[PDB]
């Protein structure tokens, strides 16, 4: 069971669908005997460059330990979900439960 770091941006108009998305994703991750190391809702952030003629995207960060099947399903969900304008899954060497700088700033 490998560790992953999931970051996905949501359409700014879909900010209230973000709690439901997070709920579904944690449900899918823990249903498959997986853990969630870190979950951070960064909220809306000004984009450094326009993405799909948009500015001010909604950022979410996840650190999960899950098998590859659920991660493939999550990537497919991100690809087919039209609200998620951009996402990126990355492997990590170990579990990360330290607050990221985005929320460490406060």
């Amino acid at each position: 069971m490998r560790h992953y770091e999931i970051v996905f941006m949501v359409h700014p108009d879909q900010s209230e669908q973000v709690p439901g998305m997070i709920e579904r994703y944690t449900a899918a991750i823990t249903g498959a005997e997986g853990k969630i190391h870190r979950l951070e809702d960064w909220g809306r952030r000004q984009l450094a460059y326009p993405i799909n003629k948009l500015h001010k995207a909604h950022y979410v960060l996840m650190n999960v330990e899950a098998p590859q099947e659920v991660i493939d399903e999550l990537e497919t969900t991100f690809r087919f979900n039209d609200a998620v304008i951009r996402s990126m899954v990355m492997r990590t060497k170990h579990a990360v439960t330290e607050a990221s700088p985005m929320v460490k700033a406060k």
Binding site: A48, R86, A105
Partner: protein
């Protein structure tokens, strides 16, 4: 320990136009320079950093 989410630190190693500064200017090790380049590219993908000064 270079993190692509540490934009405050990454902005010190990019010019005013968004380009990565060479290791000869900042005098950082080659290993941590490679880590910084990877982190800056990832942060550019996540739209946390600009690719150029235009967009």
């Amino acid at each position: 320990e270079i993190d692509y989410k540490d934009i405050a630190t990454l902005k010190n190693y990019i010019t005013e136009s968004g380009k990565i500064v060479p290791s000869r200017i900042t005098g950082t090790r080659a290993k941590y320079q490679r880590q910084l380049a990877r982190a800056i590219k990832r942060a550019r993908y996540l739209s946390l950093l600009p690719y150029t000064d235009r967009h």
